[PDB]
Each structure stands twice: as C-alpha cells, then as structure tokens.
C-alpha cells in the first residue's frame, strides 16, 4: 500500500491508480477504495457512452433542448452542448438523455461493464431531497460503485474491452481532458459531488486517467469527509497534487 495522506491535508479519503502494463494497483486506504458509494456525476462517464451508443447524442456539439428552466447553477441556463454539459456537470441534460433509453438497455450495459451493484431500481433518484427532476439513480440513490470498480471500469472502456464503439470512446476522451499546466502529461477525468444523508458523509470524487511517456494510469480519488465543503472540485485539486508529486516521472 502507498501513502498519499500528505496531498489530502487531513481530509478523509483514499486513492487508487492502476497501470494496465504491469497490472499493478497503487492503493492509498484499501478499505475505502473497496467501499461502494453513489458515483454522483462521475456516472456521466458511462451515461455519455450510453447516449452515443443509443443515438440520443452523436457528437461533442449534440444538444438535448433547453426548456428555459432557470437553475441555481447559471452555467446550466442554456441549450448547452455535450462537451459543456459534461464540464458543467449538467444534471438536466443527462437526465433528459437517460430518459430516452429504456431501463433494460441501461441494465444490460451496466451488467456487461460490471458497474458496481448495477442497481437502477430508483430511476428518478431520491425525491425526498426536494430537488424534483434534478435527481436520478446515480445521485445518492440506488446505484453504488467502489473507487476500485471505477478504475476497473475506466480500464475496460479505454483499453477497448467493452462493446462501445471506439468513435464514441474518442468523443468521451476529448470532453474529459483537463488542463494541468504540464504538456508532458495528459490528464482526463470527471468530478462528482454528493452528500450521503444517511451516514452524514460526502461522496466527493475525481475519476479518470493519466498518460505520461508511454505509460497509462486509470485512477479514482475519493473523499468520505464529514465536511460538506469537500466537493468533487476539491478532490480534483487533491488528484492533481497526487499526480504532480507521485506520477511526474
């Protein structure tokens, strides 16, 4: 096991990196990286591929149609493209996308990906949070997946071991790219922010992969901190700091 506790700065969490070359895992906090939790918006990595496979979307410019609803997040108040919806974690766009796919198609795809518990039984999500249609099975609801399962899922998608078309995977790779101010490495990923009301802990995520000098690492950074200030964006900062200190050479 490895120790990346310095990059977490006292925040409760864990990290797992996987190299498909030597089939080796670098694990910080084994018990946490094996614990299933709601994926929150990291599910957009998979819902993007589902939409492309089913023809609901077709490109990084694809739009779903904006009904004018004024959302708290003003970055959601427009007919945004796939790329924008992914980068802004736009829930209304992805809920409208998944509502165009029958549950049987989603179930078969998650079962074939071995996506954690593959439980989409609470389709509409946890409505007792009063957010109405801004809910879904992937947002603090029935679907749960461990950080290790996220990395195993990322590896199968990007190494070409799934049924998804390489054309759709290339679209996903493009919208996942993030700027880390280091052209020697390529970082891709998706943030996730949720609060587990039952256990009173955050589900803060950053899931993706790193490409550096012929080597590829699939990773999942996760926080279960008590402090609601700990969000996906904060875990993304921790991930970049882990990458800079332990994966630069």
Residue numbers in the entry: 40 to 288
Please, what does the article write about this entry?
Clostridioides difficile causes life-threatening gastrointestinal infections. Herein, we report 30 X-ray structures from a structure genomics pipeline spanning 13 years, representing 10.2% of the X-ray structures for this important pathogen. The Center for Structural Biology of Infectious Diseases (CSBID, formerly the Center for Structural Genomics of Infectious Diseases) implemented a structural biology pipeline starting in 2010 through paired efforts with systems biology, bioinformatics, and other research specialists in C. difficile pathogenesis.
The structures presented here are part of the C. difficile 630, R20291, and Y384 sets nominated at CSBID.
